[PDB]
Amino acid sequence: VDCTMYICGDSTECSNLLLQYGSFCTQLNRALTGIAVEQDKNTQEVFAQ
Amino acid sequence: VDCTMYICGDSTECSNLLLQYGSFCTQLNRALTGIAVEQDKNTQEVFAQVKQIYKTPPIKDFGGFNFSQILPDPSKPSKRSFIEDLLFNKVTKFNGLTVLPPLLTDEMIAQYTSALLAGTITSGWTFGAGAALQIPFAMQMAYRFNGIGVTQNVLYENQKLIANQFNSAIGKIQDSLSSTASALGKLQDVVNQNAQALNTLVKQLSSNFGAISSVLNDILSRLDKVEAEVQIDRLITGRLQSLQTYVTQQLIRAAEIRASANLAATKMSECVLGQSKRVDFCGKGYHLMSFPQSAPHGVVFLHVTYVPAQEKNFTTA
Amino acid sequence: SECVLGQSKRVDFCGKGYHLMSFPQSAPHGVVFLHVTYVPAQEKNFTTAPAICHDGKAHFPREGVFVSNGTHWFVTQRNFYEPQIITTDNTFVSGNCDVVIGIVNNTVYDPLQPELDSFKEE
Amino acid sequence: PLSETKCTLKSFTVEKGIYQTSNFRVQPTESIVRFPNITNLCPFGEVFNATRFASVYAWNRKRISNCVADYSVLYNSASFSTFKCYGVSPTKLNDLCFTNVYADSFVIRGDEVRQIAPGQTGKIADYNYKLPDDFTGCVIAWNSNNLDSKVGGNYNYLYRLFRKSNLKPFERDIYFPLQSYGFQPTNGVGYQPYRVVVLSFELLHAPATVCGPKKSTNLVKNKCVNFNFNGLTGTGVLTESNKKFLPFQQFGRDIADTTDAVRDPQTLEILDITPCSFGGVSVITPGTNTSNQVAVLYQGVNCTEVNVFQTRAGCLIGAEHVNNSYECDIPIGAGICASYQTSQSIIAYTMSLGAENSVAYSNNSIAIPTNFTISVTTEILPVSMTKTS
Ligand SMILES: *[C@@H]1O[C@H](CO)[C@@H](O[C@@H]2O[C@H](CO)[C@@H](O)[C@H](O)[C@H]2NC(C)=O)[C@H](O)[C@H]1NC(C)=O
Ligand SMILES: *[C@@H]1O[C@H](CO)[C@@H](O[C@@H]2O[C@H](CO)[C@@H](O)[C@H](O)[C@H]2NC(C)=O)[C@H](O)[C@H]1NC(C)=O
Ligand SMILES: *[C@@H]1O[C@H](CO)[C@@H](O[C@@H]2O[C@H](CO)[C@@H](O)[C@H](O)[C@H]2NC(C)=O)[C@H](O)[C@H]1NC(C)=O
Ligand SMILES: *[C@@H]1O[C@H](CO)[C@@H](O[C@@H]2O[C@H](CO)[C@@H](O)[C@H](O)[C@H]2NC(C)=O)[C@H](O)[C@H]1NC(C)=O
Ligand SMILES: *[C@@H]1O[C@H](CO)[C@@H](O)[C@H](O)[C@H]1NC(C)=O
Ligand SMILES: *[C@@H]1O[C@H](CO)[C@@H](O)[C@H](O)[C@H]1NC(C)=O
Ligand SMILES: *[C@@H]1O[C@H](CO)[C@@H](O)[C@H](O)[C@H]1NC(C)=O
Ligand SMILES: *[C@@H]1O[C@H](CO)[C@@H](O)[C@H](O)[C@H]1NC(C)=O
Ligand SMILES: *[C@@H]1O[C@H](CO)[C@@H](O)[C@H](O)[C@H]1NC(C)=O
Ligand SMILES: *[C@@H]1O[C@H](CO)[C@@H](O)[C@H](O)[C@H]1NC(C)=O
Ligand SMILES: *[C@@H]1O[C@H](CO)[C@@H](O)[C@H](O)[C@H]1NC(C)=O
Ligand SMILES: *[C@@H]1O[C@H](CO)[C@@H](O)[C@H](O)[C@H]1NC(C)=O
């Protein structure tokens, strides 16, 4: 998920006011990315024995 | 982490307005304290599988097998082995951040591992069950080959060959660790995951949260009560949110680490203090033994395996 | 599953010691396992051997190890001292005894020779 | 300490264990105030008392710097209908210290000071003069009935009624769009003219040269104090800098976004700022059904700032070190454990790991059991918890 997309449609005003929260929503993307890699690792560990 | 520190620098006004949220941020400290105890318990469960300390004899006749690359040198101030030293070198404030040190320092971990290792070498798996019972290593090796469907004569006739292969493989481990640090990724990602979480948490102090300034003390120096309280409150709801996010992340990460630690304790119990009949649990190949090695914020198992090779094609019945 | 409905070969999974069995017991919001274990104790120190050369033939045990308390040799199992006279049905053979290391010399009683010798006496 | 634990736990009974209770923080010892000092006073009386003023169409921007402000005498005097400040409180201006100040002088009708506020829309706000929504500063307005109001009208002051475009804030623009107002004192209050002036500050992001009548206090090093450098208060211990500082900067700033290194507002020396020491505090104690004696652990802070014992956990007080090794009863950290044994006291020691032992070994010696024993171990596990909804 893209945070800026989900909250702000395309609006620059909303994006600027989301920036001023700083870097919360990099953390969310980061966590989801970790999950995404991790789900490939699980499948790899199971089937590539 | 101290919540009051992280949110409020020292300001009584911010602290009073944090009190009126009641007892959220005791919960956060409580959770972190639970984690802190829990990380000591994990280490305890892994390494304190042994009832008593065993020190190796000064006799190094084991039928040709060499273990001076995993037993400590008495000469070091911090008694550690060559492979341990390769391991410990290939692993690289005033906001409430109090970095509690572990209960067990790396020297103590090394003591425990040396004890387990010496007991494995001198006593087979018998010290896992009851009192330690001495035995020669060659006969222990025979025992372990009998466990996997190979008769012990195959050892006693091929003893020197087996010892040379073992020593060579240990040299291979020593080489692969003495050059490449990629192999430590399991521990290294954990260390990075924590040091990154701290940095993002701390960097959240630079954000305004809907205020006139991301620094509290500017606000205190430029406003009276009724509006300073508002701007501060904007900061509170969001610094507190950052802290709670950090707590949740650390909790989940700790549960993952717990699963890893219970697995490691299982491996220590079932592959150092004995021989695993579970196929491809401790090493690939038929399992014989293992050896543990200390590592910072982790453990290292060296599985030794019997791997058939160089076969022929026979016609059977 | 692995310690009530059977015997765990996994060392020090269900109780400390060699596992035999278990018994479960109810508990509020939990369960209680009572592992029963075999724990060796009260040992002695014997001088051993890896193998034996009888006529040139190396002998190894099918089970157990060769032991010596003194002026005598025995074979016995491994978690309990129960010394047995060595016989060809306790042991087995492979190869010559120049290839083994740490070996010792001893005569192995054979249970066929006495019956056969009895018939020659007749 | 024991009472702190009892208060923290919300019980009169404390069990054997270590409990975190509070935080320790070195307090300031005094205040030190520092400011730049100029021998000039800022000419604010020259603008409010000027005999002829700027129209709103062509409004005057006078600039202020290189002077010592004195707003308190301008505040404390009563000549002003309203005195409102936005992002800043009017009593507090004498504390801060700024880089520039702009006095924006003009005159306006009364019903239109409803409209002068920043971000508020309207005719005068969008066509004549604009204040940004992020505006910081003070707006003063005072009624004029013998100054810009006079019998026979007063048409020296013009207002632009229409315009084809809106302003970028703080800009001046040079049917005909410009019109005039009649200002007699005979008309009602809404129609009288009002002298209005806007003091738009830029906060410190550069060397400040404008602030109130205060006096500095001489600096100190190596003692925790409550500083104030160019209006930035705060607490910590100041010390000389090992750093090499650049000759336009003032403030060295951290990842935490708090000041770490400053330059003196009236000296060229550079000072490193360290917050004076703190640390979490936890209590070591046994259960209360044996004794009330306790010990204290001042985490992460050693014993030169608070029987004493120094550990890599912190400063431990109330316990006595022992060079014997007894197995752990209370964990602390760094391989130290505590207990309450026999008069009687808390003691600290380096934990043992079980007894030193060694297995006899050779290549021709083995051990076999002759007997055995049947133990029965207990192993408890949880399976469920209370189904809460
Ligand atoms: C066990 O292996 C180590 C491998 O290093 C042997 O130690 C080496 O021994 C030779 C002479 O024996 C020295 O020249 C090397 O410098 C030693 N290397 C190190 C790293 O110490 C050791 O001798 C072997 N054990 C036995 C009994 O031979
Ligand atoms: C089984 O494989 C091993 C190697 O894995 C062989 O051992 C090597 O034999 C050669 C003899 O030409 C020696 O030069 C090497 O030093 C031996 N290796 C080691 C590590 O010592 C062994 O010969 C093979 N067995 C058979 C029957 O061919
Ligand atoms: C080792 O065990 C053997 C077997 O018991 C001992 O030999 C016996 O010793 C008893 C006296 O203790 C004699 O009465 C038997 O006749 C012996 N039997 C045989 C077959 O010789 C032997 O003494 C033990 N060794 C030691 C040092 O105690
Ligand atoms: C086991 O017995 C054999 C003979 O029964 C021993 O072989 C003798 O060894 C000595 C020393 O090398 C030689 O002088 C003899 O010539 C050998 N005799 C024969 C027939 O080969 C053998 O040494 C004994 N084993 C041990 C471990 O002592
Ligand atoms: C001989 O064994 C080898 C094992 O790789 C294989 O190549 C060959 O196919 C076997 N014999 C037959 C008849 O397949
Ligand atoms: C005898 O066995 C016991 C086991 O504790 C031990 O004290 C002794 O060292 C053994 N014999 C020898 C020669 O070491
Ligand atoms: C054990 O090795 C030593 C070498 O010091 C030797 O004297 C002894 O006879 C060896 N024992 C066996 C059973 O090989
Ligand atoms: C303020 O004191 C400082 C001393 O460092 C000096 O630079 C400056 O000229 C003084 N201003 C006065 C006397 O007003
Ligand atoms: C002029 O303003 C100054 C301070 O700004 C004050 O001393 C003086 O009294 C004012 N003039 C009048 C007429 O009030
Ligand atoms: C626990 O508390 C009660 C009251 O102090 C006392 O009677 C009891 O003996 C105590 N327990 C012990 C072990 O002394
Ligand atoms: C506190 O700092 C260090 C840190 O352990 C300690 O060695 C020292 O005794 C204390 N400070 C001083 C100045 O002695
Ligand atoms: C503590 O160790 C020191 C060595 O510096 C010694 O003075 C002291 O006697 C030891 N404690 C005991 C009980 O021996």
Side-chain angles (χ1 to χ4, degrees):
Chain A
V1 185
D2 175 21
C3 55
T4 290
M5 208 55 49
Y6 169 79
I7 298 163
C8 317
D10 295 330
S11 175
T12 194
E13 288 79 9
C14 175
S15 173
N16 301 331
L17 286 190
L18 192 76
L19 175 60
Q20 100 32 11
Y21 279 80
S23 53
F24 291 170
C25 84
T26 43
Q27 308 200 116
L28 308 165
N29 192 355
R30 163 176 290 121
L32 293 195
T33 309
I35 287 166
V37 172
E38 169 85 348
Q39 291 326 283
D40 292 334
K41 209 175 77 71
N42 295 340
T43 301
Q44 187 73 248
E45 285 183 355
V46 173
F47 290 109
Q49 293 281 14
Chain B
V1 185
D2 175 21
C3 55
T4 290
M5 208 55 49
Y6 169 79
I7 298 163
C8 317
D10 295 330
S11 175
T12 194
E13 288 79 9
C14 176
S15 173
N16 301 331
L17 286 190
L18 192 76
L19 175 60
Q20 100 32 11
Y21 279 80
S23 53
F24 291 170
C25 84
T26 43
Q27 308 200 116
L28 308 165
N29 192 355
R30 163 176 290 121
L32 293 195
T33 309
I35 287 166
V37 172
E38 169 85 347
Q39 291 326 283
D40 292 334
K41 209 175 77 71
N42 295 341
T43 301
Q44 187 73 248
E45 285 183 355
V46 173
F47 290 109
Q49 293 281 14
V50 67
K51 297 179 286 201
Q52 315 181 107
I53 298 294
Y54 311 115
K55 52 176 177 65
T56 181
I59 226 96
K60 304 304 199 306
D61 187 41
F62 294 108
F65 297 81
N66 192 291
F67 305 104
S68 65
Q69 313 307 121
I70 51 173
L71 290 167
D73 310 280
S75 287
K76 294 291 169 59
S78 72
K79 290 198 184 182
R80 289 186 293 203
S81 180
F82 197 66
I83 287 160
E84 303 185 66
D85 293 358
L86 304 170
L87 288 179
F88 292 166
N89 290 124
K90 304 294 175 71
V91 183
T92 59
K93 178 58 88 170
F94 43 92
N95 315 308
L97 305 178
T98 313
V99 182
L100 316 175
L103 173 56
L104 295 160
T105 55
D106 60 354
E107 48 250 48
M108 272 183 208
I109 304 300
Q111 297 306 108
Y112 270 124
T113 53
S114 69
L116 297 163
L117 173 59
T120 313
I121 290 167
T122 43
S123 186
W125 69 89
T126 62
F127 80 104
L133 306 181
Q134 61 174 118
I135 185 162
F137 190 75
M139 290 179 60
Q140 190 195 273
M141 229 25 349
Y143 288 193
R144 284 162 193 290
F145 285 178
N146 199 264
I148 60 151
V150 181
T151 56
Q152 62 187 268
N153 56 9
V154 180
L155 172 60
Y156 294 139
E157 299 190 353
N158 313 143
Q159 182 166 343
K160 303 304 208 310
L161 173 61
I162 289 168
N164 288 354
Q165 288 177 333
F166 178 78
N167 297 353
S168 295
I170 292 294
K172 296 305 181 58
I173 301 299
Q174 177 186 304
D175 180 20
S176 178
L177 289 168
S178 66
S179 51
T180 63
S182 45
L184 280 296
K186 289 311 309 293
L187 313 176
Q188 187 58 286
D189 274 23
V190 177
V191 183
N192 301 349
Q193 279 301 281
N194 196 4
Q196 171 154 314
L198 276 297
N199 293 359
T200 176
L201 176 77
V202 166
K203 269 157 51 46
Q204 286 294 333
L205 295 169
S206 313
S207 88
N208 288 329
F209 289 109
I212 64 165
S213 183
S214 45
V215 61
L216 192 52
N217 216 222
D218 189 358
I219 292 162
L220 270 293
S221 70
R222 69 189 277 183
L223 287 173
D224 291 331
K225 294 300 319 308
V226 175
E227 61 279 14
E229 67 90 2
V230 180
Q231 302 307 318
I232 292 184
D233 184 280
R234 304 301 289 290
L235 293 169
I236 307 307
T237 184
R239 287 185 191 199
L240 195 64
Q241 194 183 6
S242 294
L243 192 62
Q244 199 161 288
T245 289
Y246 172 80
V247 165
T248 294
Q249 290 311 111
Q250 292 294 112
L251 274 169
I252 298 170
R253 194 174 297 125
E256 191 216 55
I257 289 294
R258 176 95 179 138
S260 199
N262 293 335
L263 178 63
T266 302
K267 285 196 197 285
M268 181 66 83
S269 189
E270 295 184 24
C271 306
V272 187
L273 320 184
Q275 198 183 359
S276 170
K277 183 62 65 67
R278 299 166 67 180
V279 66
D280 190 0
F281 180 48
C282 275
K284 197 169 195 64
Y286 301 90
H287 183 264
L288 303 171
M289 61 186 344
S290 304
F291 300 119
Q293 289 279 310
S294 179
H297 302 297
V299 73
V300 175
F301 294 110
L302 291 181
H303 312 298
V304 181
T305 50
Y306 176 91
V307 181
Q310 301 181 38
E311 52 270 37
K312 287 186 192 177
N313 36 45
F314 309 99
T315 64
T316 175
Chain C
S1 189
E2 295 184 24
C3 306
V4 187
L5 320 184
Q7 198 183 359
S8 170
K9 183 62 65 67
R10 299 166 67 180
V11 66
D12 190 0
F13 180 48
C14 275
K16 197 169 195 64
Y18 301 90
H19 183 264
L20 303 171
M21 61 186 345
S22 304
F23 300 119
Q25 289 279 310
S26 179
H29 302 297
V31 73
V32 175
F33 294 110
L34 291 181
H35 312 298
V36 181
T37 50
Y38 176 91
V39 181
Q42 301 181 38
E43 52 270 37
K44 287 186 192 177
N45 36 45
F46 309 99
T47 64
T48 175
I52 295 167
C53 192
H54 173 64
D55 294 349
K57 303 173 280 180
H59 290 264
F60 311 87
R62 287 173 195 179
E63 317 88 323
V65 298
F66 302 131
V67 293
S68 158
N69 66 338
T71 71
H72 281 313
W73 282 95
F74 303 99
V75 65
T76 185
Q77 61 193 327
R78 235 164 318 175
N79 293 356
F80 193 83
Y81 184 66
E82 198 176 36
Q84 302 301 142
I85 303 304
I86 303 172
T87 53
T88 60
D89 63 358
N90 298 343
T91 58
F92 72 101
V93 177
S94 75
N96 179 10
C97 69
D98 303 0
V99 61
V100 180
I101 189 165
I103 193 162
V104 307
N105 278 0
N106 184 13
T107 186
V108 186
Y109 188 51
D110 171 61
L112 183 63
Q113 201 75 337
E115 306 294 294
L116 295 232
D117 194 3
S118 184
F119 192 75
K120 276 74 70 177
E121 195 276 331
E122 285 162 301
Chain D
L2 190 59
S3 296
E4 301 176 51
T5 62
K6 287 179 171 176
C7 194
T8 298
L9 277 290
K10 285 186 32 186
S11 185
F12 294 160
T13 61
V14 189
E15 290 188 16
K16 175 171 64 69
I18 187 167
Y19 303 103
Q20 180 161 34
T21 176
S22 298
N23 280 30
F24 182 73
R25 196 190 303 109
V26 175
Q27 297 294 108
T29 62
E30 73 275 18
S31 181
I32 295 177
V33 66
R34 302 289 293 165
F35 274 140
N37 58 336
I38 320 300
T39 57
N40 189 359
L41 280 297
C42 303
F44 302 142
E46 161 171 318
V47 290
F48 317 137
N49 305 2
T51 50
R52 301 285 80 209
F53 274 14
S55 49
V56 65
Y57 162 78
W59 48 270
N60 192 357
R61 180 182 200 76
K62 188 173 80 178
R63 173 151 146 175
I64 303 296
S65 58
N66 64 7
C67 57
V68 165
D70 196 282
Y71 295 9
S72 75
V73 299
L74 305 177
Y75 189 123
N76 83 338
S77 67
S79 55
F80 302 110
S81 309
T82 178
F83 192 7
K84 294 186 193 283
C85 309
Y86 302 144
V88 176
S89 197
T91 191
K92 289 299 189 180
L93 283 72
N94 299 294
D95 291 331
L96 294 174
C97 204
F98 304 145
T99 57
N100 66 25
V101 180
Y102 295 93
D104 279 65
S105 190
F106 54 77
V107 65
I108 196 62
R109 205 167 59 76
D111 301 324
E112 296 177 318
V113 309
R114 194 169 204 171
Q115 204 176 136
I116 196 69
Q120 189 50 250
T121 52
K123 314 288 198 233
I124 315 309
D126 63 358
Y127 288 169
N128 279 310
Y129 178 67
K130 181 67 176 177
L131 296 82
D133 55 355
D134 65 283
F135 161 79
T136 184
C138 288
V139 58
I140 297 174
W142 70 103
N143 165 272
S144 311
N145 290 324
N146 52 355
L147 321 167
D148 292 346
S149 190
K150 72 211 185 169
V151 290
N154 197 330
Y155 306 163
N156 311 127
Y157 301 125
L158 276 299
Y159 78 103
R160 209 210 293 276
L161 194 151
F162 290 159
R163 197 179 176 233
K164 312 194 171 181
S165 46
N166 287 342
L167 278 298
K168 182 265 287 179
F170 304 82
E171 221 244 339
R172 203 179 299 119
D173 173 29
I174 306 296
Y175 317 138
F176 183 62
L178 200 59
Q179 288 79 12
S180 180
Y181 284 136
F183 296 140
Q184 289 183 119
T186 66
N187 293 323
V189 64
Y191 275 70
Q192 292 164 18
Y194 299 73
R195 290 164 160 215
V196 64
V197 67
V198 179
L199 305 178
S200 54
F201 319 120
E202 185 16 8
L203 280 261
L204 73 168
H205 66 302
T209 192
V210 176
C211 62
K214 268 63 66 180
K215 285 79 190 184
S216 303
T217 302
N218 178 254
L219 54 81
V220 74
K221 317 190 196 302
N222 306 118
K223 177 170 65 175
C224 194
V225 293
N226 191 337
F227 62 84
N228 189 347
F229 286 120
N230 301 272
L232 295 174
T233 183
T235 62
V237 68
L238 292 76
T239 189
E240 269 297 281
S241 287
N242 194 12
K243 293 174 174 180
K244 317 192 196 178
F245 201 72
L246 277 296
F248 64 96
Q249 305 207 296
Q250 288 187 351
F251 293 143
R253 219 164 328 99
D254 290 331
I255 307 301
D257 236 84
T258 188
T259 318
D260 62 65
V262 305
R263 186 168 71 201
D264 186 339
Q266 58 189 132
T267 316
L268 309 168
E269 77 202 277
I270 340 119
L271 298 171
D272 287 346
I273 296 89
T274 316
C276 53
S277 64
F278 80 101
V281 176
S282 57
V283 166
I284 304 186
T285 179
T288 55
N289 206 359
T290 66
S291 50
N292 303 95
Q293 294 177 248
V294 296
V296 192
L297 181 52
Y298 289 99
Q299 277 157 358
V301 58
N302 67 11
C303 305
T304 58
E305 309 193 329
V306 176
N307 292 113
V308 174
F309 193 47
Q310 183 60 43
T311 63
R312 295 170 71 267
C315 190
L316 171 49
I317 300 174
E320 194 166 59
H321 185 232
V322 173
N323 315 354
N324 296 355
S325 306
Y326 296 165
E327 72 287 23
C328 194
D329 180 25
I330 307 177
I332 311 178
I336 324 302
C337 292
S339 182
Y340 182 78
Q341 66 92 38
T342 58
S343 294
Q344 319 188 261
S345 190
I346 308 297
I347 54 161
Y349 47 81
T350 47
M351 64 180 288
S352 64
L353 316 180
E356 186 65 31
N357 195 37
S358 83
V359 192
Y361 183 74
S362 57
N363 51 343
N364 58 310
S365 190
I366 198 161
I368 298 161
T370 47
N371 206 8
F372 58 90
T373 184
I374 304 296
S375 66
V376 171
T377 308
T378 305
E379 186 164 33
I380 298 157
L381 309 163
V383 173
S384 68
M385 59 172 172
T386 73
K387 293 160 54 165
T388 57
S389 172

